[PDB]
Amino acid sequence: LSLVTRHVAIIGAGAAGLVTARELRREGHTTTIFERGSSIGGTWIYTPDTEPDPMSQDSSRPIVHSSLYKSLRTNLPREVMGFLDYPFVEKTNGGDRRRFPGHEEVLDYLERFGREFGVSREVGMEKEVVRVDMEQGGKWTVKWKGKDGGGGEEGFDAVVVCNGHYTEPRFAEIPGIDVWPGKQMHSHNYRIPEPFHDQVVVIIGSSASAVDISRDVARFAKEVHIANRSITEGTPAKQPGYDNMWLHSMIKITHNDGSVVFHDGCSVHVDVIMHCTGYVYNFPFLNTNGIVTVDDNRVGPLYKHVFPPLLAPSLSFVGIPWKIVPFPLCELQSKWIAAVLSGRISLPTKKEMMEDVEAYYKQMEAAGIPKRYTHNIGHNQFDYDDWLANECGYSCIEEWRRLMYKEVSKNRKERPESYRDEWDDDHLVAQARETFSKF
Numbered sequence: 001l002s003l004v005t006r007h008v009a010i011i012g013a014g015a016a017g018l019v020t021a022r023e024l025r026r027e028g029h030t031t032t033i034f035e036r037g038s039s040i041g042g043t044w045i046y047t048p049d050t051e052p053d054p055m056s057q058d059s060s061r062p063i064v065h066s067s068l069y070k071s072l073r074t075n076l077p078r079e080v081m082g083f084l085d086y087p088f089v090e091k092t093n094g095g096d097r098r099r100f101p102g103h104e105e106v107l108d109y110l111e112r113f114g115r116e117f118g119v120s121r122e123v124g125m126e127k128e129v130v131r132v133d134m135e136q137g138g139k140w141t142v143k144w145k146g147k148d149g150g151g152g153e154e155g156f157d158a159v160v161v162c163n164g165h166y167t168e169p170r171f172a173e174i175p176g177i178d179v180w181p182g183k184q185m186h187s188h189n190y191r192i193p194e195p196f197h198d199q200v201v202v203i204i205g206s207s208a209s210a211v212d213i214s215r216d217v218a219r220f221a222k223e224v225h226i227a228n229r230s231i232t233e234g235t236p237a238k239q240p241g242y243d244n245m246w247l248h249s250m251i252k253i254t255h256n257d258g259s260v261v262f263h264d265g266c267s268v269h270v271d272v273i274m275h276c277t278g279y280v281y282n283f284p285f286l287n288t289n290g291i292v293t294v295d296d297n298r299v300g301p302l303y304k305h306v307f308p309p310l311l312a313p314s315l316s317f318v319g320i321p322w323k324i325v326p327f328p329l330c331e332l333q334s335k336w337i338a339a340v341l342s343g344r345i346s347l348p349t350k351k352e353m354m355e356d357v358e359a360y361y362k363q364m365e366a367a368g369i370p371k372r373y374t375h376n377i378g379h380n381q382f383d384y385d386d387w388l389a390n391e392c393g394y395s396c397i398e399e400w401r402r403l404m405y406k407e408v409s410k411n412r413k414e415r416p417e418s419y420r421d422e423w424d425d426d427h428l429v430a431q432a433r434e435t436f437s438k439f
């Protein structure tokens with residue numbers, strides 16, 4: 001039609017920022033991309049660096065952005081993970097050719113992406129956004145700080161926040177922890193298992209990620225005990241395939257002599273307690289005069305998890321949802337944002353957007369769902385993707401991709417120790433590679 005070109009800031013050059021830059025460019029917009037680090041890739045850049053505070057609670061601490069540990073492999077098959085128009089297939093020669101590869105293979109994929117779509121060369125590196133303010137007129141000023149202690153600022157029609165949400169930790173509440181004498185850490189600082197050699201380690205977490213770290217630690221630890229509050233029956237349970245790993249429901253009490261008692265009665269002397277309890281949203285740079293808040297991991301209000309109703313479309317967020325396949329979701333979110341900014345498609349009125357968020361909050365409340373699951377969309381994530389695709393006029397998520405997700409979700413819960421290397425959906429792989437031909 002008669003489109004409109006906007007000048008847009010992108011905050012972050014992880015996977016979300018990379019695809020957002022591409023989708024804004026494809027729709028005719030100009031952009032400035034700010035990346036605090038020295039390379040693109042965000043979380044997928046493994047670093048052995050860890051924060052000086054093992055609990056990552058000291059407010060003046062240096063921040064390490066990545067939470068990856070060294071042996072991490074994807075928890076999704078690579079066919080499922082790729083951008084919709086950029087299949088995450090094997091390289092022509094070399095690399096990690098496994099269906100569930102290591103993090104290095106994902107980073108290489110994002111770097112190839114950044115080159116293929118001309119995004120990488122435009123990222124302003126070592127530019128940390130420290131302040132984002134709305135100007136009288138509806139424009140935005142992004143102020144940034146550089147490596148040398150320099151910095152600057154720039155005005156924008158719109159700002160897309162792509163800063164990730166897997167860096168600022170949240171924690172478990174452990175009874176008696178104030179008198180427990182051992183080592184306490186957050187998994188944000190977990191990298192390698194060797195320093196746990198012959199230690200007794202408690203891992204607190206209910207996700208399959210906590211099981212991954214437990215199995216990694218169990219390579220050297222004397223004993224690994226998982227406190228998994230979603231478990232209610234049959235503990236203490238040995239982990240199949242491991243002689244030195246046990247599953248529990250929850251810590252009942254920690255003691256001054258180092259012992260930890262689980263609800264199932266198991267008592268053990270513990271050297272290390274690791275919180276694998278996840279993260280919180282954190283946008284210290286963002287000044288909205290209270291229009292956007294973060295409250296027990298509810299961000300917003302955000303229309304469709306993206307647009308603050310009062311500030312839409314000049315402010316938007318890519319990659320808020322969790323329990324998702326992230327790369328195609330961020331792709332479709334930023335495709336939607338770009339088409340809105342260009343005028344090719346419309347948003348509802350501010351009042352209608354605000355009513356939609358309120359309706360969603362009341363559905364949650366009428367279903368007993370606590371605040372902190374507001375952006376958890378694991379059950380209907382591809383319906384959400386398809387809603388975005390229909391807004392943009394893009395194809396819907398492939399059926400093989402829905403089915404692969406259900407299959408790996410089932411295998412991850414049933415066989416956490418083997419789902420990455422033993423699978424039975426070769427027929428879905430066949431389908432996926434068929435659709436990949438056109439690219």
Ligand SMILES: Cc1cc2nc3c(=O)[nH]c(=O)nc-3n(C[C@H](O)[C@H](O)[C@H](O)COP(=O)(O)OP(=O)(O)OC[C@H]3O[C@@H](n4cnc5c(N)ncnc54)[C@H](O)[C@@H]3O)c2cc1C
Binds near residue numbers: 069073128130164
């Ligand atoms: C342990 C772990 C395992 C995972 N495994 C999988 C998996 O197997 N498969 C999968 O598809 N997904 C997985 N994910 C999800 C992963 O987060 C997404 O794949 C995706 O990387 C989200 O990227 P992002 O761009 O939103 O955030 P990030 O990767 O965090 O990137 C955000 C970027 O913004 C930059 N930034 C932050 N603040 C500023 C600022 N103020 N100014 C300038 N720049 C800034 C950061 O430096 C960073 O580069 C995993 C996540 C974790 C934590």
